[PDB]
């Protein structure tokens, strides 16, 4: 209550460090920054000072997460159709759906449309596609399935314009993310018959890929709903 | 222009952003580096100059003359700025040139009586700028250079009578003869602003670390228009308490004359 | 190591001269000096092989 | 107004110089040391030159990048206070200054073997500040003087003339005025040699006066390469004298 | 010109209480933007901001974000292409510092600011001065639209051609434009800019609060 | 000259064994070794550069009096990374060509104890990042001259408090040790390449007369009196001193230089030019009648 509900970009909300009496003894409130908040610092009369302030316009939102007691309250701001979501940026660990660019030998390079959110809800990230400026990641042959790591054939796994659902093991370079398929919720999702030319084609089997319109059927890594 | 590590810059801000001012080489927040100018060689030209700093900083001014109708041609004094490998479009280039027309003014900075020849027609002055070479803000290197182009320029001297409305006589200007062009030519100095303190003629390593800078004219023996904060880089860029732009009005306005009195040497 | 060689034919220095201890550096830790450097360094190439 | 002639029956020219006389050379190395990795100022009559050898450097773009060859690249600056007359606009773009500067460097092209500096580029900026004939012949010779002293390895000198034509006899070394009176062959000499690098002629040339004013040319360009020789030579007694 | 259609090249062209109104969202094309509109006495101003960003940069290596602005001319042809840059260059400098730039590593934010329109009415018997503070205006609202980060909110005034940009509730200087006029208008013309600045502010936060509800 | 010192010159744009020309022969003996700065034909020997005829052995060669500086085999370097690319850096040294750096070829915080990772080389960013400035010894050689660098040393590595400054590599030779310790407490590292770093001396320079995992930190000493700063300031202008009058820099100049200097009271006056070409004759003269 003592902090304002909505804060401006701009708008002082919490100190840095806070406290309160009860119980008979001090129970000691942790801020600390967020989405949408950011610890800068301000002085006045020669006096420093940092203070919690928010950098986009929304309502407040507190949440505790984590003798004598101890605590730790997070501190963020929240917007409130159009959708941005910015501060969503691939992380080892994540979900994304890519779309194959290229298919070389030992490896296969692709392009992140979408990043699975945490409880499904994804997070768009808005780019040009003629341009370059879509993150680019690659996928290893090795990372195509845990089954026979060694040999794999990237032609009958991937496809170019096939919609694959796979996991970041790690950033890598500015270039290429670390794309793995290993498990059984990941591989190609949506895809068509001869590079897109043909009719929708669905997942089956975890290797192989059919098409209950034309009756073709394409090799392909597969997921599981 | 200068890359520099996150440690030296660090480094460079506490040295001078202290309290005591140190510059890195030591220098006073009011010292100016050694320069070297030499003029009046473009026998071609009514006048020229060419600066070189301590730092290999080179620039070439040059000072050309043309017969105009001063009732169709409302600015008398146009400058041009240059840089070979380096194309005439970007930002840097059009933001200086913009920048010394103003300070270069027909009725603004600089006396266009003594460009006036008769009733109808008058000098237009084209004041060409080159820089060969410069690691910082280069638009007080280019002033010093104008201001001492300007200051040896000879212009034809005229012959025919000065009354075009009645008599109309083509403007004649005799051989040989010419008059030294008379003018005050402004200076235009840049300050750095790192922390609370103000230092005049900025190195490069200073201008990498400090939180903003003053572009700040100077004619006829005080503060003239234009007045520009500049951010002298792009990472560091800081607000500015008003008593320091007041500071640094205050301090070109007690070292200018040092300069102009180590430049007015003919 | 300590060089095997004995006697020193083609020699510009003296076997005695090559043979000899010098003090570690700091940076560097001392070793047996090569006893031909100094051939090697300032003897002529035969004419032929240029 | 006034009016003039070409060669007086006096054996004077516009000017005063006669059929034979090369202009006031002067010649200047490491000029600009804090610029670039070898410079030259040239002063070849009225004519006046920077020139800026960068290099040889790493490429800005990997994409522009020879693994058997250094990248050479030359731009020519003519400023628009080269001449009398002002030039209102830039001449960057011309296309008699693209082919200049496509002419210089496949004159070099030769004259360096350039397989020595593999993964590099060598950037040639000039900057001409007065202009007065023979510009080409004084670019050629600024180019040469500020590779030089850039320690860049090169087989032999490339010495530039002019050549002004008027009856049955040429001119050494053509001015602004002369050039406009009568064409001019621009020659472009390798070392001491018979050789030509750059042979250049845009006007109209009798074809019986070619092989004699060739031979002026390449006599000329001779004492022209001596020159240089004693100029850097003597400016390397002059700086050690200064050291002593 | 093979490019664009100049026409006949042998041809000559023609030869003869303080209000705003913002409003900004209304373009699906950019991450933000805005509306600024002022009329005063006989001369009024309205200009568009566009803000795309912020976008990665593929190989980029620098630690924060970078900032790119351009001016242009929506209709009136008046102000200089040089002149134009000069401004780009002066609001480059202001934002830089208003703008949380570590918050964008291996980024860049470009900014877009059409001038459509400027209406300037001279009694007969500087000049782009008086927009640079709406250009400001412009940018803060469709920076904040956008969703960066700005450390504080920019604002700014003009005062006999002198041009002061202000953060922090005035307690300090982001920006200094100075041309022409009167000198000793120092004091004043910080005094007078700081209460434009304070109007502007609020009716700019107020702005966000009306079209974010 | 209160404020600023401006030199003025009108009516010029500026102001001011045997002999070797271009075009001209060495020698005729077709039995030479032909080296660098040489050209050959039969039995003329001709000079490519403009410098002085060298004779070693069989192996005529000419020495430029001008010219780039050359990577050799063991030298200590001082350069400033200019890109990082794949598993590698390419530092800028002052060559013809930038540093080359190899993963393998730099030591990791924490060392031995440290278990090799497959993460290091897309997080090669987090130890050298663009700009920094570092330690290296030229290991090897490529074919075409270029050099890889290593930093698999203590004495090697990251440089910080303190600050940088550059002199022609040709004022710079090749010595037992580059790293020497200097009264006010500060330390100079003497890059082969001409690349010099003073800082303020560290424990490690202490060490030598007589934390593995804050060796990449950009963080400074937080603890760094004026006196030091200030004297930085000062070696830091008399090395640009001794550059001006082409004086080989070496220890023993640079303190001597330093003391010498302490006439001038404000540091600031050593930038002119008359004092640091006194400067540097009087180290020359002092080394006259001391020897």
Redesign the interface.
């Known amino acids: 209550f003592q902090f304002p509900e909505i804060a ?3 708008k002082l909300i919490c100190p840095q460090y806070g406290t309160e009496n009860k119980d008979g003894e001090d129970i000691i409130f942790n801020y600390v920054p967020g989405p949408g908040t ?1 610890l ?1 610092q ?1 002085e006045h009369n020669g006096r420093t000072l940092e203070a919690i ?1 928010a ?3 929304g309502t407040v939102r507190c949440e505790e997460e984590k003798r004598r007691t101890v605590k730790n309250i997070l501190v963020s701001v929240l ?2 159709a ?1 959708n ?1 979501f ?1 501060n969503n940026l691939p992380k080892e660990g994540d979900i994304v759906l890519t779309r194959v660019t290229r298919l070389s030998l030992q490896r296969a390079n692709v392009e992140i449309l979408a990043v699975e959110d945490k409880p499904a809800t994804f997070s768009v990230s808005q ?1 040009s596609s003629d341009l ?2 879509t ?2 990641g690659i996928i290893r042959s090795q990372d195509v399935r845990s089954t026979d790591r060694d040999r794999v054939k990237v032609i009958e796994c991937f496809k170019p314009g096939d919609i694959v659902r796979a996991q970041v093991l790690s950033l890598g370079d ?2 290429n993310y670390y794309l793995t398929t290993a498990r059984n919720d990941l591989g190609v999702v949506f895809a068509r018959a001869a590079n897109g030319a043909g009719g929708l084609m669905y997942a089956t089997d975890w290797q192989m890929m059919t098409s209950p319109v034309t009756g073709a059927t394409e090799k392909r890594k597969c997921a599981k709903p | 222009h200068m890359s520099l590590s996150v440690a030296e810059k660090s480094y460079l801000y506490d040295s001078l952003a202290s309290t005591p001012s140190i510059r890195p080489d030591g220098r006073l927040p009011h010292q100016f580096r050694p320069i070297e100018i030499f003029t009046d060689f473009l026998p071609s030209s009514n006048g020229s100059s060419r600066i070189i700093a301590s730092d290999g900083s080179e620039c070439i001014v040059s000072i050309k003359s043309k017969v105009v109708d001063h009732h169709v041609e409302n600015e008398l004094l146009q400058v041009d700025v240059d840089i070979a490998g380096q194309r005439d479009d970007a ?2 280039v ?2 200086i ?3 010394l ?2 300070v270069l003014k027909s009725g ?1 900075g600089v006396d266009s009586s003594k460009l006036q020849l008769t009733k109808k027609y008058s000098f237009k002055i084209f004041v060409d700028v080159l820089v060969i070479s410069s690691h910082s803000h280069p638009i007080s290197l280019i002033s010093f250079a104008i201001y001492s182009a300007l200051n040896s320029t000879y212009l034809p001297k005229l012959i025919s009578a000065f009354d075009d409305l009645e008599v109309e006589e083509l403007p004649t200007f005799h051989d040989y003869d010419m008059v030294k062009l008379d003018i005050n030519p402004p200076l235009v100095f840049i300050l750095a602003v790192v922390g609370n303190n103000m230092l005049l003629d900025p190195a490069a390593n200073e201008s990498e670390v400090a939180n ?1 800078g ?1 572009i700040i004219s100077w004619s006829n023996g ?10 002298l880089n ?2 560091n ?6 008593h320091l ?2 500071q640094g ?1 205050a301090m070109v306005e007690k070292y200018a004359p040092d300069v102009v009195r180590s430049l007015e040497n003919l | 190591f300590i060089p095997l060689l004995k006697e020193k034919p083609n020699a510009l220095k003296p076997l005695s001269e090559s043979l000899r201890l010098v003090d570690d550096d700091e940076n560097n830790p001392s070793h047996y000096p090569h006893p031909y450097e100094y051939e090697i360094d300032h003897q002529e190439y035969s004419p032929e092989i240029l | 107004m006034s009016r003039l002639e070409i060669y007086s029956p006096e054996g004077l020219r516009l000017d005063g110089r006669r059929w034979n006389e090369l202009r006031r050379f002067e010649s200047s190395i490491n000029t600009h040391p804090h610029a670039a990795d070898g410079s030259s100022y040239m002063e070849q009559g009225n004519n006046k030159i920077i020139t800026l050898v960068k290099g040889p450097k790493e490429p800005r773009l990997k994409s522009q990048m020879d693994t058997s060859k250094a990248l050479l690249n030359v731009s020519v600056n003519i400023t628009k206070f080269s001449k009398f007359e002002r030039s209102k606009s830039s001449h960057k773009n011309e296309r008699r200054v693209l082919e200049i500067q496509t002419s210089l460097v496949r004159m070099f092209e030769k004259n360096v073997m350039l397989n020595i500096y593999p993964r590099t580029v060598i950037d040639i900026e000039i900057h001409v500040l007065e202009q007065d004939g023979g510009i080409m012949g004084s670019l050629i010779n600024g180019i040469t003087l500020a590779l030089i002293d850039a320690g860049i390895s090169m087989f032999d000198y490339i010495s530039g003339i002019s050549v002004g034509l008027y009856d049955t006899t040429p001119l050494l070394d053509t001015n602004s005025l002369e050039e406009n009176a009568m064409s001019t062959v621009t020659l472009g000499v390798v070392g001491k040699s018979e050789k030509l690098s750059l042979l250049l002629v845009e006007d109209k040339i009798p074809l019986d006066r070619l092989e004699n004013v060739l031979a002026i040319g390449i006599a000329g360009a001779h004492r022209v390469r001596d020159l240089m020789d004693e100029e850097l030579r003597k400016h390397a007694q002059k700086r050690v004298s200064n050291a002593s | 010109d093979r490019r664009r259609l100049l026409g006949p090249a042998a041809a000559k062209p023609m030869a003869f209480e303080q209000e705003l109104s913002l409003h900004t ?1 209304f373009i ?1 094309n950019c ?1 933000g933007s805005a509306l600024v509109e002022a009329r005063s006495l006989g001369h009024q101003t309205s200009l568009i901001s566009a803000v795309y960003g ?3 940069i ?4 620098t ?2 974000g ?2 790119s602005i351009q001016l242009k001319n929506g209709l009136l042809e008046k102000y ?4 134009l ?2 401004v ?3 609001l ?2 202001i934002f ?2 208003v703008v ?2 570590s ?1 964008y590593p ?1 980024s860049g934010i470009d900014i877009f600011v059409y001038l459509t329109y400027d209406k300037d009415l001279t009694n007969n018997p500087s000049q782009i001065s008086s927009l640079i503070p709406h250009c400001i205006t412009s940018i803060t609202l469709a920076l ?1 639209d ?2 960066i ?5 920019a604002g700014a005034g003009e005062a006999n ?1 002198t041009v002061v940009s ?3 509730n005035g ?11 009167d ?1 000793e208008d ?1 004091l004043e013309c ?1 005094d007078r800019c700081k209460e434009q600045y304070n109007r502007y502010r609020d009716l700019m ?1 107020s702005c ?2 009306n079209q ?1 509800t | 000259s209160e404020v600023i010192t401006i030199t003025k010159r009108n009516g010029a744009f500026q102001n001011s064994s045997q002999i070797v020309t271009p075009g001209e022969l060495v020698t005729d003996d077709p039995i030479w070794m032909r080296g660098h700065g040489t050209y050959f034909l039969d039995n003329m020997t001709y000079s490519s550069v403009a410098g002085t005829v060298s004779r070693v052995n069989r192996l005529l060669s000419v020495i430029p009096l001008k010219g780039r500086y050359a990577p050799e085999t063991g030298d200590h370097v001082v350069g400033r990374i200019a890109e ?1 690319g794949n598993k590698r850096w390419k530092v800028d040294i002052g060559g013809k060509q930038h540093a080359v750096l190899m993963l393998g070829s730099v030591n990791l915080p924490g060392g031995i104890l440290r278990r090799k990772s497959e993460s290091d080389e897309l997080q090669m ?1 987090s130890f050298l ?2 700009g920094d400035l570092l330690n290296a010894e030229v290991q090897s050689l490529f074919q075409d001259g270029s050099a890889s660098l290593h930093t698999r040393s203590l004495k090697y590595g990251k440089l910080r408090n303190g600050m940088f400054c550059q002199v022609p590599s040709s004022l710079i030779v090749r010595a037992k040790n580059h790293t020497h310790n200097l009264p006010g407490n500060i330390t100079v590292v003497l890059g082969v390449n001409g690349y010099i770093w003073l800082r303020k001396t560290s424990q490690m320079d202490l060490a030598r007369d007589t934390s593995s995992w804050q060796i990449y930190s950009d963080e400074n000493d937080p603890s760094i009196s004026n006196n030091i700063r200030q004297a930085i300031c000062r070696y830091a202008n008399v090395i640009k001193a001794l550059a001006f009058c082409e004086i080989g820099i070496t220890q023993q100049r640079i303190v001597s230089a330093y003391e010498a200097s302490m006439v001038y009271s404000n540091v600031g006056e050593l930038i002119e030019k008359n004092v640091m070409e006194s400067i540097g004759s009087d180290i020359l003269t002092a080394e006259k009648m001391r020897g």
């Open positions: 401006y970009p701009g950011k800068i301000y302030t950098t986009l316009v917007p409130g159009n941005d910015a780019a370059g400026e993150f680019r500015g270039t | 930002l840097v059009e933001t040139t913009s920048l027309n103003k603004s903003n003053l005080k503060i003239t228009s234009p007045i520009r904060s500049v951010a792009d990472s860029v800081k607000s500015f308490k008003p732009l007041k009005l | 969202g699906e991450n912020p976008r990665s593929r190989g980029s290596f630690s924060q970078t900032i200089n292409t040089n002149e840059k000069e780009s260059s002066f480059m400098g830089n510092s949380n730039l918050r291996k904040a956008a969703g980060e700005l450390v504080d909110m051609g202000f953060i922090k307690e300090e200087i982001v920006g200094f434009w100075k041309d022409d006029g000198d120092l910080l936060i966000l609060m974010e | 990082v960013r990042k663009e």
